[PDB]
Enzyme design. Structure first.
Site, PDB file in Angstrom:
ATOM      1  N   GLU A   1       6.871   5.320   4.530  1.00 20.98           N
ATOM      2  CA  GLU A   1       7.617   4.103   5.145  1.00 20.98           C
ATOM      3  C   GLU A   1       8.926   4.416   5.466  1.00 20.98           C
ATOM      4  OE1 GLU A   1       6.867   0.667   2.488  1.00 20.98           O
ATOM      5  OE2 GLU A   1       5.847  -0.356   4.028  1.00 20.98           O
TER       6      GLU A   1
ATOM      7  N   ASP B   1       6.111   4.492  -0.458  1.00 19.81           N
ATOM      8  CA  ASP B   1       6.765   3.233  -0.207  1.00 19.81           C
ATOM      9  C   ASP B   1       8.151   3.236  -0.105  1.00 19.81           C
ATOM     10  OD1 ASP B   1       5.686   0.215  -0.835  1.00 19.81           O
ATOM     11  OD2 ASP B   1       7.241   0.339  -1.967  1.00 19.81           O
TER      12      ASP B   1
END
Ligand code: CA
Ligand code: CL
Ligand code: CL
Length: 653
Positions: free
Chosen positions: A377, A348
């Site tokens: 990400e 994340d």
């Protein structure tokens, strides 16, 4: 964000304790650089040994408890030890006890769970002492991973533990729990397979689980599971312990551990690997977290004016670049690998983590098993962490072997993620063909304007749906007013086909196979189960669409040409063909990657009418996929097509 107003004081310390060096000074990082492998507590019946890193504290205690919500039974002073640590050996059998640390930093006394907690009481408010070898399932010693030759051979299926089973017709007994995904032979409406048997039947290779580490009580109160509850869990509290609400008994410290291991064991035995969504970029509340109570000012990032850097928009950022936090994150990941046999990590907001930390993670994982996946990400986002150190797409050259979600491909295929009405390639928008081509090539520097951020195709994760933003179905609906249901289904199927025939790593959202809808909800992070469950009734009504996804997955498995490992192979074997607007056509030539066929031809057709297309003069083409769209294949060869969807032809050896 669940970070709240803090009714209290943060005291960053009496600097005389640390030789006049403040926790904010650059020189602090050179002090107290503990390198040992024993942070936390090591239990044995004979004795338990504690070690806490708390260099700014003037005093430190171990506080022992007999019950998860009881009064302290002992409060034992710790000994100041080497390199900023504190130690204690309790010469009694501490089995079944709970503990916290109590420190005095400056004039403040604070009490905290061990950051290295491997087990906790309900809602994670106390550390639990136990021997984790007692939590191993039968045969755990012989757990064996399904083979994985290349990241490009993975097919990822992104799934939330509660979504999987909480629908009332899921046919699964332990609804909402880790154990729900261990149940075999479960049946839904009309007797369809559900749960694990549905997932294995699709042919995916990796289940990527939304947060299964212990997240905050604000997200889900583990003591109120008889009342409605739901959260994605992006609010981390105890990084090295599983989430309590996915266990059958959050009050039994061992239950969540044993049951997660049983889940991983069963998935491995059924041919699936497990990727953990991890959230090392922030904690649920920067004022309340154990890090801040134990060493205030060290583990989180601060602006020059001493306020929190809030580049995550969650209230805080973890200071991954400081040595003891880099150590914490690496040892956390290694704990999930060693203790739980995890097969990959999805980071994340990876652009909030520094490059040095990410490369060291990759290096340490490679020493153990290079087939362990690392994706994340890699968004470009502001933070006090300098730009050149952010582990994002702009810096992908410095992050070899780490995959990043390809948002350019996502938007080109299905249209703008934030302007909901805007069409993309599948839905008849103009000028998206080259964006699709860039993704077909795995995001690499293919040539001309066909280039993105990837050096190698293992760095590009292709997707048209995930837990964030509208589902592909809901986005198609918002951007195709006046289109029929059948027309929208054809666009949906085309998007999935593009993901599964592009170079890189294909990524599917759980339920994409039955056109998952959230009724238009854009961000469902705390929406009720009625919004978030895997709707097995819808799955039962969409078995043709499920079979279509299964057949795309099988097509990719059958053709190594779709899974080339290197950019040099892609540039040598992939050729884009001249093609009319609202189509993309390409060939994979000359047995690419060991493909059994001499050549492949792929057409992404977003044109609803009839077309006569020129085919490259490479031999006797034959239809391999999408024959429903092929009116004729003329052997000067031409393809007569009609309608929206993918066609694949091949020239046999
Ligand atoms: Ca929790
Ligand atoms: Cl529950
Ligand atoms: Cl940036």
């Amino acid at each position: 964000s669940v970070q709240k107003e803090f009714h209290g004081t943060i005291d960053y310390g009496d600097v005389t304790v640390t030789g006049g060096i403040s926790v904010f000074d650059a020189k602090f990082d050179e002090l107290y650089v503990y390198d040992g492998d024993d942070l936390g507590a090591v239990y044995a019946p004979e004795e338990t040994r504690f070690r806490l890193w708390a260099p700014t504290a003037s005093e430190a205690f171990v506080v022992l408890y007999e019950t998860e919500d009881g009064m302290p039974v002992k409060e034992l002073p710790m000994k100041r030890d080497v390199q900023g640590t504190w130690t204690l050996t309790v010469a009694e059998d501490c089995g079944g006890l709970f503990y916290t640390y109590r420190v005095k930093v400056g004039e403040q006394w604070n009490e905290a769970v061990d950051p290295y907690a491997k087990a906790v009481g309900v809602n994670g408010t106390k550390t639990a002492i136990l021997d984790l070898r007692s939590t191993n399932p039968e045969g755990w010693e012989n757990d064996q991973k399904p083979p994985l030759a290349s990241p490009t051979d993975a097919v990822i299926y992104e799934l939330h533990v509660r979504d999987l089973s909480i629908h009332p017709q899921s046919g699964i007994r332990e609804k909402g729990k880790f154990l729900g995904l261990t149940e075999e032979g479960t049946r839904g409406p009309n007797g369809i397979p559900t749960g694990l048997d549905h997932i294995t039947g699709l042919g995916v290779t990796h289940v990527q689980l939304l947060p299964i580490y212990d997240y905050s009580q604000e997200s889900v109160d583990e003591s109120r599971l008889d009342e409605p509850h739901y959260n994605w869990g992006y609010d981390p509290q105890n990084y090295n312990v599983p989430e309590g609400s996915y266990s059958t008994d959050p009050h039994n410290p061992a239950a969540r551990i044993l049951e997660l291991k049983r889940l991983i064991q069963k998935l491995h035995a059924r041919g699936l690997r497990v990727i953990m969504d991890v959230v090392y970029n922030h904690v649920y509340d920067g004022y309340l977290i154990h890090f801040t109570k134990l060493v205030p000012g060290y583990y989180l990032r601060y602006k020059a004016d001493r306020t929190f850097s809030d580049g995550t928009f969650c209230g805080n950022e973890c200071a991954s670049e400081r040595p003891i936090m880099r150590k914490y994150i690496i040892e956390s990941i290694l704990h999930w690998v060693r203790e739980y046999h995890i097969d990959g990590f999805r980071f994340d907001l990876m652009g909030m983590i520094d490059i040095e930390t990410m490369n060291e993670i990759r290096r340490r994982l490679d020493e153990i098993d290079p087939t362990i996946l690392t994706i994340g990400e890699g968004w470009m986002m502001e933070t006090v962490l300098p730009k050149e150190l952010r582990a994002n797409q702009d810096n992908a050259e410095k992050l070899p072997g780490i995959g990043m979600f390809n948002d350019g491909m996502r938007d080109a295929v299905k249209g703008d993620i934030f302007i909901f009405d805007r069409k993309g390639f599948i839905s008849g928008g103009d000028g998206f063909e080259d964006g699709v081509k860039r993704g077909v090539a795995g995001g690499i520097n293919y040539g001309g304007q066909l280039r993105q951020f990837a050096v190698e195709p293992v760095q590009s994760v292709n997707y048209v749906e995930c837990h964030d933003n509208h589902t592909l179905w809901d986005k198609i609906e918002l951007s195709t007013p006046g289109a029929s249901d059948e027309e929208r289904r054809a666009m949906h199927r085309l998007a999935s086909a593009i993901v599964l025939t592009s170079q890189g790593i294909p990524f599917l959202h759980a339920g994409q196979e039955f056109m998952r809808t959230k009724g238009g909800v854009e961000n469902s992070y705390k929406s009720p189960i009625e919004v978030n469950w895997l709707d097995w009734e819808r799955c039962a009504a969409h078995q043709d669409d499920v079979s279509y996804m299964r057949s795309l997955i099988a097509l990719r498995k059958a053709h190594p040409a779709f899974r080339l490992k290197t950019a040099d192979e892609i540039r040598a074997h992939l050729r884009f063909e001249a093609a009319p607007p609202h189509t993309v056509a390409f060939t994979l030539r000359d047995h690419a990657g060991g493909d059994p066929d001499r050549h492949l031809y792929v057409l992404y057709n977003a044109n609803p009418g009839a077309l006569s297309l020129e085919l490259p003069a490479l031999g006797p083409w034959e239809v391999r996929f999408g024959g429903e769209h092929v009116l004729a294949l003329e052997a000067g060869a031409r393809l007569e097509v009609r309608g929206v969807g993918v066609v694949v032809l091949a020239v046999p050896r």
